[PDB]
Design a binder for this molecule. Structure first.
Ligand SMILES: CC1=C(/C=C/C(C)=C/C=C/C(C)=C/C=C/C=C(C)/C=C/C=C(C)/C=C/C2=C(C)C(=O)CCC2(C)C)C(C)(C)CCC1
Ligand SMILES: CC1=C(/C=C/C(C)=C/C=C/C(C)=C/C=C/C=C(C)/C=C/C=C(C)/C=C/C2=C(C)C(=O)CCC2(C)C)C(C)(C)CCC1
Lengths: 304, 304
C-alpha cells in the first residue's frame, strides 16, 4: 500500500472540515473584503485572546518589507496589501511567498499594530462587508477558538505569489528539563518518543523515528514525504509546540504494520495555554516500529 | 485593476457553498472520493441523464481508456485512485492535459463500464467515512445546478500538472440566430455578448473585449487578455444556452459603466433538464468594450 492509501486509516475520525470549507469561501471574496474581514475578526478576537509577540529574528527578517510599506503613501499601502491578498505577481508578493508561516504572521501582526495606531492605511471608517463576506465572518465567529485561529493562519499563509526564509532553529530542550507525556491505553515507544521529542524541539531525534520514505500530514494539507522534507517542515514550522495527548487506541494493520490513533490537545506558541486545539494523531508504524505515515487532524469538536 | 473590479455589485449572493463543498470533498481519502461520486452519479441518474460525450472527445480519450480497461482489477482501482490523489504518473499527466469536456467524457465511459462490471467497480456494500457521508449529504441538498458544478470541479481537479481540446464547432449560420431580450437592458455590448456566445461565434465575441480585458468564470480567478479568453471560449464554452432575464445599469469610475444581469444558463451536458441560476457582472469602458465580466452561480433562485 501507498502513503496516499494510508490517508484512509481511522476513516471515521471526525475532522473539522468546516475549516477548509470556510477558507475556500473566504478565498472567493474581493481582496478589500478579505482584508476588512480579517481586520474585523482580529479586532473582536483580540478582546479576549492576545497574540504572542513575534520573535526578534522573525521581525528582523520581515523588517525591510515592512519599512517599504510604511514608506508608501496611503493609497499605495492599501494597494500593496490588496496585492498580497490577490496573490498578484509583484516583488513584495514574491518576497512574502518566500517566508515561513511565522514570518508572514509576524509581518501582519506589525501591520495590525500600525493600522490600530493610524500609521498605515487602515480599513476605511464605517466599512461594510459584502453579502458573502458577512456570512463568512459569521461562520468564523461561530467556530471553536482553535478552528478560528487555523482559519486565520491559512488565510495569512495563502497570500503572496509563488528560496525559503525561516527563523533560526532553537536548541533542543536540555535532557534533564524534559517532561514525558502519558497516554491512556498507549505505551507504544515510537508514539511516546514522537510526542516527547517534539515537545523538546528535538527534531534530529524525532526524524529518526521515520521510515526513509515516511510522511507526515499536517491538518488539511497533503502529506509531506521523505525525511528531508519532513525534517525541513519540523525546523521551519514546528518549534515550541506543546502536545498534550490524552488517550489512544492501537490496532493491527496490513503487512504486519500497526495503526494507532491518539487524541488530545495542542497549544501553539502564538497563544500559549489560551487556545487548546482538539487534535487527533493517526500513526501507521511498520513492523520495526518506524513511522511510515502520521496524520495530524484538527477535530470537529471536543465530542470528537 | 482587474482584481479591484472583482468587487463590483459586491452584494451579489454567490453560491459559495459550491467551493466550500469542493474543499471538503478534496480532503477525503481517494477511495471515498471515488465512491462518493459513484453514489452521487447513480442517484442523480435516476432523474437526470447526462448527454453522451462527443465523438471527437471520445477519440481523444480512447487510448487512456483502453489502457485502463486492459489492466487487471486491482491496477484499475489504483489508476483511478492516482487520478483522485493527483499523483504524478503518465496517465495523470495525460488527464491533466485534457479540457474539462474530455475529462468528463473519460469518466462518463468508465461509469458505464463500472455499471456493466467490465472495469473494477466500487466494492459491494461500501460505506463512506464520517466526513464523506456528510459531504454527500451536503451535495444532495443543493440545487441541481450546484450539484453538477460540484461534480464538474471534482472531475477537473483530478490528475497531475500541452493542451488537448475538442475541435471548434463552426458558428451558427446568421439567418438561424435568435436574439436575447433582457428587461431593463438595451446595452449593445451586453446583448452582443449573449447573442454571440449563444451562436458559438467566438471571433466576434472576443472583439467586444478590451485588449487587457478579463473574464471570470464561477469560482475561478480572472482569465486575462484576449489570447487567454479566446482560448477559454474555444476549449470550454461551446454549445451553451444563455437565457438572461433582467438587469440593472449604473455608472462606474472613470466614465465606465457597470451592468449586472441575472438569468439562467444551460450546459449541453444536461440541455434543458438543468437551468443554473447565473449573474453576469460587466464593467464596460467609455467606448463600450468589456474590461471585465464575471459570471457567478447564484446561491438560490432568490438571488435572481
Ligand atoms: C492578515 C491581516 C491582519 C493580521 C492578521 C493576524 C496578525 C493574524 C494572526 C493569526 C495567528 C497568530 C494565528 C496562529 C495560528 C497557529 C496555529 C493554528 C498553529 C497550529 C499548530 C498545530 C495544530 C501544530 C500541530 C502539529 C502537530 C501537533 C504534530 O504532531 C506535528 C507538527 C504539526 C502538524 C505542526 C490584519 C489584522 C492586520 C488585517 C489585514 C490582514
Ligand atoms: C468522476 C467519477 C465518475 C463519473 C462522474 C461523471 C461522469 C460526472 C459528470 C458530470 C458532468 C457531466 C457535469 C457537467 C457540468 C457542467 C457545468 C456545471 C457547466 C456549467 C457552465 C456554465 C455555468 C458556463 C457559464 C459561462 C457563461 C454563461 C458565460 O457567459 C461565459 C462562459 C462561461 C463562464 C463558461 C464515476 C461515476 C465513474 C465514479 C468515479 C469517479
Amino acid at each position: 500500500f501507498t502513503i496516499d492509501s494510508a490517508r484512509g486509516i481511522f476513516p471515521n475520525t471526525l475532522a473539522a472540515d468546516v475549516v477548509p470549507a470556510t477558507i475556500a469561501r473566504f478565498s472567493q471574496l474581493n481582496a478589500e473584503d478579505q482584508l476588512a474581514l480579517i481586520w474585523f475578526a482580529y479586532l473582536e478576537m483580540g478582546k479576549t485572546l492576545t497574540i504572542a509577540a513575534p520573535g526578534a529574528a522573525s521581525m528582523q527578517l520581515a523588517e525591510n518589507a515592512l519599512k517599504e510599506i510604511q514608506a508608501m503613501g496611503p493609497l499605495q499601502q492599501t494597494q500593496a496589501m490588496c496585492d498580497l491578498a490577490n496573490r498578484a505577481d509583484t516583488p513584495l508578493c514574491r518576497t512574502y511567498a518566500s517566508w515561513s508561516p511565522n514570518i508572514k504572521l509576524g509581518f501582519w501582526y506589525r501591520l495590525g499594530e500600525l493600522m490600530e495606531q493610524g500609521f498605515v492605511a487602515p480599513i476605511p471608517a464605517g466599512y461594510q462587508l459584502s453579502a458573502n463576506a458577512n456570512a463568512v465572518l459569521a461562520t468564523i465567529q461561530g467556530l471553536e477558538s482553535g478552528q478560528q485561529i487555523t482559519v486565520l493562519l491559512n488565510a495569512v499563509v495563502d497570500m503572496g505569489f509563488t528560496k525559503r526564509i525561516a527563523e533560526p532553529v532553537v536548541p533542543p530542550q536540555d535532557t534533564a528539563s524534559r517532561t514525558k507525556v502519558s497516554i491512556e491505553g498507549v505505551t507504544n515507544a515510537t508514539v511516546l518518543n514522537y510526542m516527547d521529542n517534539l515537545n523538546a524541539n528535538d527534531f534530529d531525534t524525532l526524524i529518526e523515528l521515520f521510515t526513509s520514505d515516511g510522511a507526515l500530514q499536517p491538518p488539511f494539507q497533503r502529506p509531506i514525504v521523505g525525511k528531508e522534507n519532513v525534517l525541513r517542515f519540523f525546523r521551519e514550522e514546528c518549534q515550541n509546540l506543546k502536545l498534550i495527548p490524552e488517550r489512544g487506541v492501537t490496532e493491527p494493520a496490513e503487512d504486519g504494520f500497526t495503526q494507532i490513533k491518539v487524541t488530545g490537545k495542542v497549544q501553539t506558541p502564538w497563544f500559549g495555554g489560551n487556545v487548546g486545539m482538539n487534535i487527533a494523531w493517526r500513526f501507521l508504524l511498520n513492523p520495526e516500529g518506524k513511522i511510515f505515515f502520521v496524520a495530524i487532524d484538527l477535530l470537529a469538536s471536543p465530542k470528537e
